[PDB]
Amino acid sequence: TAFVSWGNFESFVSSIINAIYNSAEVDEYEYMKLLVDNYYSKGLFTTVKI
Amino acid sequence: ILINQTVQNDFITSLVDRIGLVVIRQVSLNNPLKKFKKGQIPLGRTIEEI
Amino acid sequence: MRITFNDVKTSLGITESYDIVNAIRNSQGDNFKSYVPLATANNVAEVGAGILINQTVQNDFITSLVDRIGLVVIRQVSLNNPLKKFKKGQIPLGRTIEEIYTDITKEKQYDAEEAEQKVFEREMPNVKTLFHERNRQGFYHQTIQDDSLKTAFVSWGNFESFVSSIINAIYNSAEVDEYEYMKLLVDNYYSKGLFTTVKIDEPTSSTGALTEFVKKMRATARKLTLPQGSRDWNSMAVRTRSYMEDLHLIIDADLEAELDVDVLAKAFNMNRTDFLGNVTVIDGFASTGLEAVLVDKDWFMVYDNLHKMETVRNPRGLYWNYYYHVWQTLSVSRFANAVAFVSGDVPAVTQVIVSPNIAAVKQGGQQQFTAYVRATNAKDHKVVWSVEGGSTGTAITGDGLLSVSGNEDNQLTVKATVDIGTEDKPKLVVGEAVVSIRP
Amino acid sequence: MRITFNDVKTSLGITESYDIVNAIRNSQGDNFKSYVPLATANNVAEVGAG
Amino acid sequence: TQVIVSPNIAAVKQGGQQQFTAYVRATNAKDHKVVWSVEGGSTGTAITGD
Helix, strand or coil: CCCCCHHHHHHHHHHHHHHHHHHHHHHHHHHHHHHHHHHHHCCCCCCCCC | CCCCCCCECCCCCCCECCCCCCCCCCCCCCCCCCCCCCCCCCCCCCCCCC | CCCCCCCCCCCCCCCCCCCHHHHHHHCCCCHHHHHCCCCCHHHHHHCCCCCCCCCCCECCCCCCCECCCCCCCCCCCCCCCCCCCCEEEECCCCCEEEEEEECCCCCCCCCCCHHHCCCCCCCCCCEEEEEEECCEEEEEEEEECCCCHHHHCCCCCHHHHHHHHHHHHHHHHHHHHHHHHHHHHHHHHHHCCCCEEEECCCCCCCCCCCCHHHHHHHHHHHHHCCCCCECCCCCCCCCECCCHHHEEEEEEHHHHHHHHHHCCCCCCCHHHCCCCCEEEEECCCCCCCEEEEEEECCCECEEEEEEEEEEEEECCCCEEEEEEEEEEECCECCCCCEEEEECCCCCCEEEEEECCCEEEECCCCEEECCEEEEECCCCCCCCEEEEECCCCCCCECCCCEEECCCCCCCCEEEEEEEECCCCCCCCEEEEEEEEEECC | CCCCCCCCCCCCCCCCCCCHHHHHHCCCCCHHHHHCCCCCHHHHHHHCCC | CEEEECCCCCCCCCCCCCCCCEEEECCCCCCCCCCCCCCCCCCCCCCCCC
């Protein structure tokens, strides 16, 4: 009842579907960055002073 | 306008102004750190490096 | 786990009238003398109307064996509503329906002198809009255990018959409820006073009450089907015209039986005295005075949005759950003719219609309002005009001219009131309109 | 330019000889018994008039 | 003429509830009102006016 065109309806539901994959990619990137942050926090890097 | 309201036509008060154009915003997000992934592990939980 | 009932008598909810078992034995030359020769009449009268609750009965010969059930019959019915020809198509997308009508204007006298300085004056057309939205959403739920039902049967055919009856009950209920909703539409329309009421209970002069209702319906149909039209048959007080082939008359079974006995029988060439519109017979309306309703084909504005059926299975409880979802919008059009034939004591004035039902004026503008009183009698009733919501300086004259003060910002309501009751017992019929202020 | 209405009663000048909702709710064996099983009867009586 | 209760036979639990419908067979058009009662005898079991 919120739409008038079947094309718009399908586009909206497809966007809803793609939101899941977008969130998954964002979370994976954040996890991979957290890996480096944790490695630095535990002090296992070779530190070079600047 | 965050929340819209019904507006009557200026010439005729009985008629209400309609919605002309509807646009759907689409976005696709990836992660730069995708090339650093290895293969799959169907069975098991532990990886040993020697 | 044992569901059992005790101390249940044959006459559970029976209110006897004259105790025929005593009447037969006390009859001396009465109308019951024919039943005296009967011997087992007492046993027949004890259980001749059936037994609501069963109980095990031992046979007369040996008090150890148990009488058995020797016949099982299952009754099934198919029901469908007759008011399906009044339904429109489907609405796949959207919720609201807009209906726009343009009325006629008023004539002005030719005057070149006044024509000097108002060549570019604006005359707003008299248009009206009506909105209809979806209002019915529902579903029917039924569960089938189809494992505990096997202990109540001894054959593999009665089980399937019972299952089929259970399945068909959902569709029967759906049809019945659709019919009830479509009848409730008419009942609510009559309750709100939006019909045009015609009294058919009065005699012609002294004894011409045999065909008075026939004459009234024929005359009403003829005057609704007029080339020039009229504004006395719709709740919007708008000049409109109907057509004979588009007029549908829903009558009562009592009215049909009265007609085809007191008119169509003792009359030659009954094509000149039969009903005019397309006749549909129902059981009877819920209103006290309603007897028949004559409407236009476009009066009904009912649409359907959803009709679906979905099933689920619970394996832990071992049953099937059935859902039947029905979504519909049920509305009527106020721009179509609508006459209700009544026979009771209706009020003198039905309702008052204000022709401009919506207005938008500025702080220095003026508005003109017109009132139509749907009086059921020949008497004339005066109309009192009032305005509410104004701060100060906003007044409306007795003619219906509303003026707005130059310094205010509020939503005004204009009310036209007709008093039909006597002194110390007022009965007010009010028609109101909404006015907005544009700064 | 922009004219709006804040809130308008659903009746708006409708005078009822009797209240159908109340008649349906408070009834025993009358002609309104058939309307009791209906679920959206109140909504239909409120909106279906137009 | 008579009064008919739609569920003639019922089985309920100690914490359950039951709904009953009454149909009155009236030979005239006059309306009638019906009173509900229970003669189970247990304290705490009660039937409302509906």
